[PDB]
């Protein structure tokens, strides 16, 4: 009419209406999963696999929106995601239960302000009283089932059937290398894919695994020093054709006979220099392996883009693809390189470990492609989900047994100072009502009968429902004695970022305009 | 092609009130926020006046025309573009009542002109002078992070703004705001600001870990040919022969070894110890080589430079830029007195101070990695705009709405003379400025009428300059409390208006015609 | 059905300034006629206010129930329902403007209220007395006759009215119009006019030129049957036989014969001379042979007389009707002074005068045969209850457009209280009473404002009653020329504004139901 050129809706009078149908459009996608459930949705892109996933990591990473209110939670659940291990759809559900809750505000008759003010009050009340239900503690961090039980509850949220092997070889994996005192990375455990058996075959391996035949001589020596490239087996005598059929055997005779001796002299002078093996990336040849089996060289044949990137970012070296001989500029530190059969497979083995910054690689196997995948994702959530930073954990009763004990006290702390600051108090008091409605849900059962016996027993803090089905009318189950904790500082944040993000939604919304050419 | 009617006045009201009625909810502290996005999806965020109006797509070529002449008026003074609109839309909105009622365009600009007259009187009259100190100063840098950024890191910026004021102004010519570099970074916290009272060196040296503390140095800026890559050249032209280019190698190689034996004799004889460092700025390589026996000796080189470092340094130290390393005088280096080096990210800066006077002072600030740095930059460059015109004069009058209301008070009853046509103008002036003080109420959160009839009975009773409270709605005098304002943005504000509501309803028929 | 909206406010206020800008022509003595014509060609001029409101077909029910409620308080005083809507739609717009800026009606209610209260404080106050005389009277009737008829005719008419009231009122009671007849002619002339002190009879006798110089003359009324139709009659049922018939034909001609003999021996011994005559009034017919017999002796018997004449004649003498012509107390004969006999036209009039008790003035009025004499009919009506209006008090106010601005002066400046709610519908109440006299200026052919201005600069200089002047538009007093007014009239017309502006505001929603 005057600024917009007939393309958005926006105005005097979308406030109330367009900015929040689109984020509960968003977070309506997403309450299907959140919690032990066979929810799989399937994700076509440009693959052209098919493949079912769980996790709305993926979900959302797929998913292409065109909208700045449902791009300004992505925004926040990449940050969550690059500071703690878990921690997505806590996030978008509060901000969309906060936004269903204050658009009846909206529509009553008040002001931003105000719900601004009190949301920001009602956090910093929830911040200040949150250090106040520690209950377990981590002991010591040498021992074994310490940390099993940690990562059976961790790896519970996404595999249900298997969870106790993996779980077992996260931590002999884990306790390997350095514990969380000190330092510990996190980018040096690397996890192989191995097409032979299933699952229930796996072990452990301490330092490189790579699925590497071998044509030549077991070198156990410690000259041998590494020479990664790129194609140095690709062409460097370009032959063409002459006539239809055959030309002369003379020519022919010669050419092969120049090729052997550039060959012969270009792997002398690549031996003679200080490199006693040599990685390659390219085709093979009957008179090329030859030359290897008669010159005790190791000769690859496998060759991949990851492995040739993975070696060039732990080793330091760079790859020449050069026609003439050049020098010997790719000196590592790697010296005891090791062969060894596993799976009727040839694998290396490097040695190069000095009390300090420690490698592993776990070894998978399963039957397809489409099945280590979530695995994977499993085994690096546990990783992720053990650092911490911090000796002691603190860990807390999760699962939706300290969010009812956090609301019914922002709820008695809200009845007492007057004004018109109780309705936001008491609007983010029933946000936190969110978490056990949706593992309700996607049980089975109702979830107004689980609220009514979670409020009505006690306010012990140490009550929540179960899976079973001996446990979802009822809901009367103690997690302290069996083992299912959550993050502290995890959910501090998930809570941090969400009332970020809920006002910065509420402060942004007048009149969305366009920027001229 | 013929057209003899009013239509031109009535749509050119209506395009006046649409453009008020867009821009209208961003006055006084409590204002909402926009967004634009359009361009590849870039969301971007602000709530200046001037950047929003040069930033827009008006399909109206009237309300066009009128922001971009709204814009070519901010130049002038600090930030005076907004709270504009409202006035001449209400001057407009009466002048259309006037002569649908009946009257003549001449009588009503003859009483705008007499208005504005008066009230620049009054504005003259009314003007009082007050000691520039610290406490002033730091009250208005408040006030303008207040009326930009939200209240909660309006505090470590105003005060860095006020010491680097401070630091800088020292002589009595009026200051100049090119000496002040702001930079930016990325890091993971919000609030992070930092005063540096000397330069900042974006780039370091290719190996680390030798010395730093580096008291007294000496700094030469140079532009020679020192290692620029190992590659083969010649003279840009390819050629056939390989001894030509290798003789020419064998060149360049023996003179860059002359070039390091010559500044190495000359580090050994303007030196011979380890207190005195020389450091040297190129923005060719340095191969590790050479690098490693000048620093065996105690001489620093670091690569890579750019252009506005090297000028930043030859314009405060005082060195001459010359294409040699010869053994000359040394009178062209410039004197350093504290080196660091900080190490954060993947490229470490250098930080030099305590060197000869200090007029250059950096105001580093990081963010939390989005697009809210280049709203808190403008923020803070509108915050050091309104210092700067804060203090180049003696006079400033309170605001917070209490020089409107007295200017309507003084215009309505002490007329300057008893003139009916000349009334029916004054009247219609002084009922729009009012629009201030009822915006400000209607955005606070409270009634229009009821706290305008109450602040204008406060100001019949007591007398003095009642301002208007956005907490309880209660007529207070802003004269204790802290509102500030400027001397010259008023006056320019008036003309302003004056300018446009008289050049606008003289506008007889517009005819559809024209080429270019 | 359902409908939550301020649709209806919306409406109703088209409605009135369309009721407003109707009827707004007909204001001040320079005003434009109208006419009126649908049933069979009938031309009717007219140019008052409830006259037109009255006979018209409004399309609008709001506008037809304003119009109803407006001409049912006309029955209170003389003329009011003229000068009423203009100052209805100003308050009205000023209400809806107030409601479209932000405020409630009640507030707007109690405003208007205590406007009208002090408003009428004013008027008691400003009041003054006057000795009613001969020139007030003379005046008010002209400017009545001015501001109805045209400036011509408007001489002979106002000495005829001011003779008639001197005549009828000589007692201490409030006069009545109930004994003054206004009867109309045709003639071929139209300036003509005439004042009889006494009655007036259409019809006279069938035999005329015998006498007409009859001194004191008794008068007596009845109702026999003297002679009604020579046809023979029975009782209302006709039958076979003639004789019966006959025989009742030849009674009825020997009672005939037997009152005409009885009343000719009463006439010869209440009498016996020439100066002593008789005049018989009857409503049935007179046969020439006993006609002539009975002007023979000097008594004069008219035939065909109407019901309202000789109700007239036994109200103003003083007579008893009988049914019986026999000799009985002369106390029932009325006593005459004057009898004259007018011809003209096909029917001559009779005009008896000097009789005693003069309470009986006609004013007999003749036009060019057209509908004119109904105009000049209500025109003098229109006088005659001015002038009633004007003796019944001894206060009369001067006008031409002198108690407005006063009005508005005093509800401006000297405000009875401090509040800005009231005083924001006492500037609309003050503001809506200057439409009369921008109104006159515009309608007597000047400017609108200029004029306006001259007064207000006239009336803050000197300080006295300034009035309009409709002819060279200067500011004149109009306590010297002749212009005067009432005063319960202005009174009642506040009242009644007050009334109907009070009862719109409150209209919520408008629903569609009802089936009576
Ligand atoms: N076996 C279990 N028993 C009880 N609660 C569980 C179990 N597994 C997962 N949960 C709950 O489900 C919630 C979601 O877990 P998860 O999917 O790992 O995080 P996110 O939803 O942020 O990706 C957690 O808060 C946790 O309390
Ligand atoms: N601290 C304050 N308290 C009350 N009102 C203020 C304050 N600071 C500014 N204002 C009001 O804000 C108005 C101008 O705001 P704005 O249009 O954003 O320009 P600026 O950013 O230069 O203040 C002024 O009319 C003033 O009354
Ligand atoms: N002689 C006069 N000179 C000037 N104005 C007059 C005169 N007589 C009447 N008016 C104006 O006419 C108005 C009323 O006229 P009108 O509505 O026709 O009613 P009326 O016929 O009772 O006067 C008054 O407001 C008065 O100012």
Not at chain 1, 336 to 350: K, N, P, R
Not at chain 2, 4 to 16: E, G, T
Not at chain 2, 201 to 227: F, Q
Not at chain 2, 484 to 504: E, F, G, M, P, R
Request: with cysteine; glycine share 8%.
């Amino acid at each position: 009419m005057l600024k917009e050129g007939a393309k958005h809706f926006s105005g005097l009078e979308e406030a109330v209406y367009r900015n929040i149908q689109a984020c509960k459009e968003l977070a309506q996608t997403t309450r299907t999963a959140y919690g032990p459930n066979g929810m799989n949705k399937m994700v076509i892109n440009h693959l052209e696999k098919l493949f079912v996933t769980n996790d709305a990591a993926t979900i959302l990473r797929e998913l292409e929106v065109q909208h700045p209110a449902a791009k300004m939670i992505v925004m926040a659940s990449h940050m969550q995601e690059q500071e703690v291990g878990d921690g997505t759809n806590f996030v978008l559900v509060f901000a969309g239960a906060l936004l269903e809750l204050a658009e009846e505000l909206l529509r009553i008759g008040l002001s931003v302000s105000e719900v601004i003010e009190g949301y920001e009050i009602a956090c910093r009340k929830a911040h200040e009283i949150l250090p106040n239900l520690v209950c377990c503690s981590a002991k010591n961090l040498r021992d074994i089932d310490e940390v099993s039980s940690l990562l059976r509850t961790s790896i519970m949220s996404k595999q249900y059937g298997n969870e106790v092997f993996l779980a077992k070889l996260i931590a002999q994996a884990c306790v390997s290398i350095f514990p969380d005192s000190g330092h510990f990375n996190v980018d040096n455990i690397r996890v192989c894919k191995i097409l032979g058996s299933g699952i229930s075959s796996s072990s452990v391996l301490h330092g490189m695994v790579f699925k590497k035949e071998t044509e030549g001589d077991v070198t156990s020596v410690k000259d041998a020093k590494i020479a990664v490239y790129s194609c140095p087996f690709d062409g460097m005598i370009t032959e063409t054709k002459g006539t239809v059929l055959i030309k002369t055997a003379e020519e022919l005779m010669n050419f092969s006979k120049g090729e052997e001796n550039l060959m012969d002299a270009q792997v002398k002078a690549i031996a003679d220099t200080g490199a006693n093996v040599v990685v390659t990336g390219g085709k093979v040849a009957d008179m090329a392996l030859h030359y290897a089996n008669k010159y005790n060289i190791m000769l690859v044949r496998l060759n991949s883009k990851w492995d040739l990137r993975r070696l060039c970012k732990t080793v330091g070296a760079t790859a020449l693809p050069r026609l003439t001989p050049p020098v010997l500029e790719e000196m590592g530190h790697c010296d005891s390189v090791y062969l060894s059969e596993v799976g009727d497979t040839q694998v290396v083995v490097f040695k190069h470990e000095k009390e300090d910054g420690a490698i592993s690689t776990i070894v998978l196997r399963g039957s397809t492609d489409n099945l280590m995948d979530d695995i994977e994702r499993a085994v690096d959530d546990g990783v992720n989900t053990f650092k911490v930073l911090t000796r002691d954990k603190r860990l807390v009763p999760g699962g939706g047994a300290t969010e009812i004990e956090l609301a019914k006290q922002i709820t008695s702390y809200g009845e007492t100072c007057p004004g018109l600051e109780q309705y936001a108090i008491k609007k983010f008091a029933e946000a936190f009502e969110a978490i056990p409605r949706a593992l309700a849900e996607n049980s089975g059962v109702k979830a107004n009968e689980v609220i009514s016996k979670l409020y009505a027993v006690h306010q012990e803090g140490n009550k929540n429902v179960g899976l079973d089905i001996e446990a979802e009318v009822p809901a009367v189950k103690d997690m302290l004695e069996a083992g299912i904790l959550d993050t502290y500082l995890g959910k501090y944040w998930a809570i941090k970022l969400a009332t970020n993000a809920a006002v910065t939604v509420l402060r942004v919304d007048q009149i969305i305009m366009a920027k001229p050419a | 092609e013929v057209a003899r009617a009013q239509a031109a006045l009535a749509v050119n009201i209506s395009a006046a009130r649409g453009l008020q009625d867009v821009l209208r909810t961003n006055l006084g502290p409590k204002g909402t926020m926009k967004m634009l996005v359009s361009g590849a999806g870039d969301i971007k965020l602000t709530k200046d006046g001037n950047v929003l109006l040069h930033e827009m797509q008006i399909q109206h070529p009237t309300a066009s025309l009128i922001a971009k002449v709204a814009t070519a008026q901010d130049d002038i003074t600090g930030d005076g573009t907004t709270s504009n609109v409202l006035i001449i839309g209400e001057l407009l909105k009466q002048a259309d009542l006037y002569i649908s009622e009946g009257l003549h365009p001449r009588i009503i600009t003859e009483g705008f002109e007499a208005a504005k007259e008066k009230a620049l009187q009054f504005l003259e009259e009314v003007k009082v002078s007050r000691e520039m100190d610290r406490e002033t100063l730091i009250d208005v840098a408040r006030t303008s992070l207040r009326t930009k950024v939200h209240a909660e890191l309006a505090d470590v910026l105003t005060e860095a703004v006020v010491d680097s004021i401070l630091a800088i102004k020292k002589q009595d010519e009026p200051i100049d705001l090119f000496m002040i570099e702001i930079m930016e970074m990325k890091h993971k916290s919000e609030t992070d600001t930092s005063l540096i009272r000397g330069l900042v060196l974006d780039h370091g040296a290719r190996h680390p870990d030798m010395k730093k503390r580096v008291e007294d140095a000496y700094i030469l800026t140079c532009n020679v040919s020192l290692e620029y890559e190992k590659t083969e050249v010649n003279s840009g032209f390819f050629y056939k022969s390989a001894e030509e280019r290798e003789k020419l190698v064998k060149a360049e190689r023996k003179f860059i070894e002359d070039r390091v034996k010559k500044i190495i004799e000359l580090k050994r004889k303007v030196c011979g110890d380890s207190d005195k460092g020389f450091v040297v700025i190129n923005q060719k390589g340095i191969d590790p080589f050479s690098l490693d026996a000048l620093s065996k000796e105690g001489i620093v080189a670091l690569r890579r430079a750019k252009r506005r470092n090297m000028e930043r340094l030859t314009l405060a130290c005082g060195g001459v830029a010359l294409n040699s390393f010869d053994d000359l005088s040394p009178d062209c280096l410039g004197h350093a007195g504290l080196v660091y080096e900080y190490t954060l990210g993947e490229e470490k800066f250098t930080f030099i101070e305590k060197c000869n006077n200090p007029r250059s002072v950096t105001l580093l600030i990081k963010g939390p990695n989005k697009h809210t740095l280049t709203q808190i930059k403008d923020a803070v460059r509108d915050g050091l705009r309104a210092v700067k015109n804060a203090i180049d004069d003696g006079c400033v009058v309170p605001g917070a709405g209490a020089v409107e209301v007295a200017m309507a008070e003084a215009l309505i009853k002490h007329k300057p003379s008893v003139k009916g046509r000349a009334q029916l103008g004054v009247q219609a002036f002084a009922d729009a400025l009012l629009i201030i003080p009822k915006v400000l109420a209607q955005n606070s959160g409270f009634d229009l009428q009821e706290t305008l009839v109450k602040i204008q009975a406060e100001h019949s009773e007591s007398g003095q300059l009642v301002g208007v409270d956005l907490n309880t709605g209660e007529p207070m005098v802003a004269a204790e409390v802290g509102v500030w304002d400027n001397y010259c943005v008023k006056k320019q504000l008036l003309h302003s208006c004056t300018v446009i509501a008289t050049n606008i309803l003289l506008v007889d028929e517009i005819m559809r015609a024209g080429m270019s």
